[PDB]
From a paper:
l-Asparaginases hydrolyze l-asparagine to l-aspartic acid and ammonia. The prototypic class 2 enzyme is EcAIII from E. coli. EcAIII belongs to the Ntn-hydrolases, which are expressed as immature polypeptides that dimerize and then autocatalytically cleave themselves into α (∼20 kDa) and β (∼15 kDa) subunits to form the mature (αβ)2 heterotetramer (a dimer of two αβ heterodimers). The same Thr179 acts as the nucleophile in the autoproteolytic maturation and in l-asparagine hydrolysis.
The introduction of Cys207 resulted in small rearrangements in the Lys203–Val208 region. The side chain of Cys207 has a slightly different orientation in the two dimer subunits. At position 211 a nonpolar Val is present, but this substitution does not affect the conformation of the catalytic Thr179 or the efficiency of the autocleavage process. In other variants, for example RDM1-12, differences are visible in the regions of α-helix 147–159, loop 200–208 and loop 116–120, while in RDM1-38 differences are only observed in the region of α-helix 147–159. Analysis of T m of the autoprocessing mutants reveled that they can be divided into two groups: those with decreased (RDM1-3, RDM1-8, RDM1-29 and RDM1-37) and increased (RDM1-12, RDM1-18, RDM1-24 and RDM1-38) T m values.
Residue numbers in the entry:
A (entry chain BBB), D (entry chain DDD): 179 to 313
B (entry chain AAA): 2 to 159
C (entry chain CCC): 4 to 14, 20 to 158
Write the structure that this text describes.
């Protein structure tokens, strides 16, 4: 699974996600990746999210929309919405993985509850940050 | 706010124990180049939507990441790929699931978004739509790598 | 304890309307009886949707609309608000009751969703019957296809 | 497209949705019906929802889950939530249709913005209500 989220200079949000799925997967099975609100969501009013992890769980939890709704309706900050979904709701459904999110205000979050998540982020005209492991 | 990109190439059991620095650096170098390309497009005034498309197209091309080239194998030693893209402005979206003959499923997903009255297309149906829009047909053999084949054998019995 | 059903939303003699009313009543009545008898919400929405699939008046199973190519492609999904488990199939043409296939995916597989032949193979390998897609074809829906093309 | 939503005597909600799609549809098209939180969602904490109509719009607006999030996080009554989604947010994206929804208190809502929704409901050991057209 791979993904990207962007805020542009016009203030527009977008999200994209792509995968080959799980090694040895049953032909015809579909995880969260291609499912709007599970593996991928963006709305200029909230957040752009791209998700990676247990598809069954990311679908049942609507991981990516849940970030949006928690912010839009709940009044959670991105940091708060990300902790809630990735560190609490997804583990209690048996979900492992993480996500990348950018909110309309340009806050960036890269939460994951796994050992690692291949990831990078940068502000325009700034130097990038990369990561594999925690911290 | 400030224009910004985030990318990922997957989450899970990545063990510090299991890698050399040279191995780690191949992933850091890949990630850095892709995020740097997106930072350059953003800075030039390209849309979030075009930026998240090219980033995911580069992560697809990158054989280290499980999407497009380097996709994992199915139990039948096939590849079946899915992708999604969403425009936060228009709230338009597009997706493909179960495609095996499209090199860049995030491009097929952009095509569903921008050139159809639909959000999601699957299988040969999705492929036939894309070919009809002039998207090029490939063999699913293009996605195969030894790394991912090795992981397949390691996971099973002969 | 309560049930709601629908047979779809969209753009008639009374006798004709009454056929829809009758069908809807028998199905809501069956679901009410099951509820009263203590059956699970899960079993009740499954059977209600199975009966709506079997009814040729509604666009699901028997009476499914026609594609641009005069074929039938069916989707279904079921969700249990108790365990929050779910199951779905999309693009299936040889399963009489896609809602029963969705249940099977929910119960007997680790995935929420399966599609196309792979959804069908999963089902057949678990004893679900293969049908000809012809069996969904009705006269009313064919003529609605020809109308649509015009 | 057909659906059912149910609350049982144990206070469990469930939802189910099935369809042939839309007449003349492009082969390989997939609407809201098979997508959790789009055509179908059940959670004992909120609501069970089955949706029918413009598949593309019910996906983009995550209609089924949006009812649940509006109630849970937003504090909307089932009635207010259903009115917002079906009367305001679905048409704002160029979609028509409706949905059936039962909350954990056993309120029933059957909103649609179309000329017609074939629909019926009843509390256990009560005579059912049926309907095709508006009101
Ligand atoms: Na790749
Ligand atoms: Na039917």
């Amino acid at each position: 699974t791979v993904g990207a989220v962007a805020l542009d200079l016009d203030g527009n949000l977008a999200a994209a996600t792509s995968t080959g799925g799980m090694t040895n997967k049953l032909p015809g099975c579909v995880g969260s990746v291609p499912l709007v609100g599970a593996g991928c969501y963006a709305n200029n009013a909230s957040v752009a999210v791209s998700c990676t992890g247990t598809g069954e769980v990311f679908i049942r939890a609507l991981a990516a929309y849940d970030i949006a709704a928690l912010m839009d309706y709940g009044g959670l900050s991105l940091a708060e919405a990300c902790e809630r979904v990735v560190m609490e709701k997804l583990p209690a459904l048996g979900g492992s993985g993480g996500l990348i999110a950018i909110d309309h205000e340009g806050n960036v979050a890269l939460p994951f509850n796994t050992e690692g998540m291949y990831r990078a982020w940068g502000y325009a005209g700034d130097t990038p940050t990369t990561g594999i492991y925690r911290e | 706010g400030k224009a910004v990109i985030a990318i990922h190439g997957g989450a899970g059991a990545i063990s510090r124990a299991q890698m050399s620095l040279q191995q780690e650096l191949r992933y850091i170098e890949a990630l850095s180049a892709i995020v740097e390309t997106g930072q350059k497009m953003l800075e030039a005034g390209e849309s979030a939507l075009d930026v998240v498309t090219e980033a995911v197209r580069l992560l697809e091309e990158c054989p280290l990441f499980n999407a497009g080239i380097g996709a994992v194998f199915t139990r039948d030693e096939t590849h079946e790929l899915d992708a999604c893209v969403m425009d936060g402005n228009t709230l338009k979206a597009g997706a493909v699931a179960g495609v095996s003959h499209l090199r860049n499923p995030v491009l097929a997903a952009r095509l569903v978004m921008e050139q159809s009255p639909h959000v999601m297309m699957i299988g040969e149906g999705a492929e036939n739509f894309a070919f009809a829009r002039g998207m090029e047909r490939v063999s699913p053999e293009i996605f195969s790598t030894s790394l991912r084949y090795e992981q397949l054998l390691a996971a099973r019995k002969e």
